[PDB]
Design a protein around this ligand. Structure first.
Ligand SMILES: N[C@@H](CC(=O)O)C(=O)O
Ligand SMILES: N[C@@H](CC(=O)O)C(=O)O
Ligand SMILES: N[C@@H](CC(=O)O)C(=O)O
Ligand SMILES: N[C@@H](CC(=O)O)C(=O)O
Lengths: 328, 328, 328, 328
């Protein structure tokens, strides 16, 4: 039987509420051991080792825990005996952790993130099936070299493309610019596409000696916008700013002016969008070259932040960072 | 023939680029008169009066223009001769303008917002058809008392529900929590649903004597989040803050602490979500009553901002504002 | 406590498989009584009476069972003590039964259909939450006069608009031409829109004296299509044919010829589409008036069949049936 | 400049209506030469040769034309000078043609299918931009070995996954089980994923010596279904039947009995679904091995028909055909 390690971080999958029919609960309340005992059929599939990396709601995730988790995954997958890793994780920021790992894990062995939109104490809790299916994906031969994936609601999503697109639904995960790469239905795994953007072994990023990640803020654009948040981010030592712009990455004028100043001072300014999907494109209404900005293209603000944080471990050059957004 | 007024504000619909096959352009470059001449068939449908309210990209919209526009629409619709108003507008913040008008226009006569994702100079420009269809919706008997609507890509969307969900696509408008209320296909108008949330005549808000709207900022949540933007918004005189939270409206703990302080100081803190769709609910992981926050429920951050701005014209009470978010 | 009757028909909600982690199962295997005992919290909400109408997979539904079910619902809702009815039903044809009831139930009291995409024996079975939520929708004051609704996956869908759009997903139900009318999240019910198309009390149809429904066949269009299936449907006594056409209701020429003959012989031919969404429109590429056909507009083939079956209980006139498709 | 051949077959892209503001038109009314002259900017990109293969609405497509087209594409791509082929085609059955070519074209050079939902005579006609973008995709270096693609509405869809999902919308194309593999925005081409199912050079099918394809019918399932259409298809010499079943490929019992007889007589019976998306799976409610049926898995009925037609050129064995549906 293949050997897999499950790394637990917390989340609603390890969550608990007082009533099976009320929505109120606490995430990251249940230990890995207790979680794995709820789904005994996984032991028929693999030899499982569990480990507790953290016990938090993913809304409390930090770069420190990301670094810890990436180093540990890399350690585990370097072992001959370990065929894959599964990470149990809150859904709120699962897309950030997955995207981070997709660019920092140096292996072609599967890494699967899995969560739940309902706590295990809930009626019709989704976690048990999601976990069963994640183990099936982790051990499947076709899961090699697919990059880091999210397995939720019978779907396999590529880390670069995945996002949580709804606040409460069990089907909240989507890949709005592509779609899922595969399915897993009562454990039966099928892939239909793969990412052609570089990941994992092909990624230039390496965090093995990094203790702290660069600071990157995200700003939310709107009419009658301001300059005070740009200024506050600068004052707090931001090395990069993601601007979640109106439509195709458009800023309000006051804000644009403040961002132009930030970019002159050596803070990388990257244009994304608040809309939800599509590319924040070059050569539309904003002259990025003149203003000193990067266009994030087909990402979203929160994943663009992760990519910019990694870019900043190597460079702050505008062109070099544009190339990184145009590659990964 | 019915008489309709077209109020122009600018946008890509009145936009212009150097090449029909390149994506670069300037919004709000074409006058209303020139715009109406591109689509002569509208004169077969109605007697059209055009009026220039502004000439800007909608990313430059301000409350001052919203107020000017709302007062002018109310004036026009009070006239016996005027059957409807159409507003030509940039797509980037069309949803904010429409939502604002939906709560401030005191008439049951149709108000239709229309724009274009491609400028009129482009190959396969969408503006002409969108405008033709908007005039048909404006004059349709079933359009009465539907509230303010957006007409884009052969669809009719309710202002409360509509959002721009894609950066570039002609089909970027959606109503992710409901769906379109009707269709318009080569001028043929059909409605299938209507909003059951109060709007227009049934709205408690009145801006007739308002010259400036309260300041409301929006913050974008993520892992390793900060308190400095909350603090900067407070220091700039924010009367309300929309927090675009992780998943179902969840803040990072440092940020939560700063928001709790903001709310004690008398600044209304309203929880929305960065995810895109769904309700930011009460009684999930965040104890809104204990912390002093409002849950925005089934809105998004930019529309929640508009509602909170209107609410703040008369109250900063947490419970009264919750009731407003739970009603409109 | 409000009194509600649950009418069980079978389906995967009342289904059973040998293993909680295998996809294989039998629908309609579990009695109503056993089903209701799996979700004891419903008794806190209402006084429940259960009844067994049938015990089948919805793929075995027949017009006979529809008639039985509609007469029984009408009987129950005529009682002063009965506040609503819930029907437990297979998901495969739930949209047909719901649409049928939406046009034959003569009450404004709620009628809620509910099912499950996973049997109750499955890990992470959806039925229990779906049922809990359906009871909440049934007793909610705002559910009056909404027409017949489907409650699945925390969503409330209008019967006219709902369809099963995926083979296996718990979120398989959608309303592709509108969207859901409301939500129900751990029992909390909210409506955002309502249908403006006539239903229930406003429907002209009455099945109280009908023992058998007219025969209507559905044909699937494609390139290199044939005339032999039209001819076979005619020979078997079809009173109507739904043609699920290519794109916007387009037939292949051989088939068109056979359909033209059918329509001359007095068999109503109604044009729908195989695509999934949108209106099958008048005055596009097919000259319906010349050929003797009806355009089904914004329905799908299977719901168009139900509507045509009901239309045929009153008339076979082409114009009158066009008007019915243009109204309901 | 790269040399490309444009093969015209007809469709709404080569369509014409009497009015730019009315929906009525005739497809396949405009010659290739006239079509290419509407979009002169394509001559800046490539050296274009046009060729008229047919002049029809795609609803009139036949296997004879498919064969003619496939042989001609293979001929053209065998030429050293020809870098790609673009096929202008009606949208109604573009997905069938693309899928067929995806299994029969023995080259890695790009083949792009393109159409339009509005005729060139219409206001805001989509054809010009779609064609411009198709030429850019055809000449892009990353388009090699992606298989046959559909380019519509700024999107690039894999032939195996694409379908027309709406009757009238310019954005009617989708890939509901995956999503688009790339984008093309004012000619700028980007790929994000690729199919991992075998196509083109890797396909086992060869039609070079085929003059006529096997007959395969499609049936549309519903409640109170019949056996007469199965019987009529058998009597007309069907070699295969696609059954568009209820939910996850479920037949009505009378129909099932007739299909079981068809399969005993040596006619291949393949189970698909009427629902629109998802896999019609093995080992759910239907025992395919016992009954003698194939499960079509993640296709739809019209594409399953194409695959079964190709399969039938060499085998009618149930297990061999299952393996084909489970591979391609
Ligand atoms: N707040 C939770 C939500 C979930 O897991 O569904 C988390 O992200 O940890
Ligand atoms: N920036 C433009 C975008 C558009 O109209 O499509 C505007 O909103 O004015
Ligand atoms: N075949 C089942 C499927 C389900 O209920 O999910 C039925 O419709 O009865
Ligand atoms: N009936 C037309 C529809 C279109 O091209 O849009 C065709 O498929 O040829």
């Amino acid at each position: 039987k293949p050997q897999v390690t499950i790394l637990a971080t917390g989340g609603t999958i390890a969550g608990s509420g007082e009533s099976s029919v009320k929505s109120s609960y606490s995430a990251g309340a249940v230990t890995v051991d207790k979680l794995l005992a709820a789904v005994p059929a996984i032991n028929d599939l693999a030899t499982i080792k569990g480990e507790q990396i953290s016990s938090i709601g993913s809304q409390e995730m930090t770069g420190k825990v990301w670094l810890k988790l990436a180093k540990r995954v890399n350690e585990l997958l370097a072992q001959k005996e370990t065929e894959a890793v599964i990470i149990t994780h809150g859904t709120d920021t699962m897309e950030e952790t997955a995207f981070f790992l997709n660019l920092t894990v140096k292996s072609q062995k599967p890494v699967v993130l899995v969560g739940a939109m309902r706590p295990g104490s809930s009626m019709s809790a989704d976690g048990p099936m999601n976990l069963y299916n994640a183990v099936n994906v982790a051990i499947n031969k076709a899961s090699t070299n697919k990059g880091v994936v999210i397995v939720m609601n019978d779907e396999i999503h590529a880390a670069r493309e995945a996002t949580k697109l709804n606040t409460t639904a069990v089907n909240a995960f989507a890949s709005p610019n592509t779609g899922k790469i595969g399915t897993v239905y009562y454990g039966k795994v099928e892939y239909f596409t793969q990412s052609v953007r570089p990941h994992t072994l092909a990624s230039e990023f390496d965090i093995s000696k990094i203790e702290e990640l660069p600071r990157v803020d995200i700003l939310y654009a709107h009419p009658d916008d301001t300059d005070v948040l740009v200024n506050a981010a600068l004052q707090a030592g931001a090395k990069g700013i993601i601007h979640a712009g109106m439509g195709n990455g458009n800023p309000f004028p006051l804000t644009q002016n403040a961002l132009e100043k930030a970019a002159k001072s050596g803070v990388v300014v990257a244009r994304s969008s608040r809309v939800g999907s599509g590319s924040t494109t070059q050569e539309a209404e904003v002259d990025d070259k003149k203003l000193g900005f990067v266009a994030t293209e087909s990402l979203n603000p929160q994943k663009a932040r992760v990519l910019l944080m990694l870019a900043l471990t190597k460079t702050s050059d505008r062109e070099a960072i544009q190339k990184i957004f145009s590659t990964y």
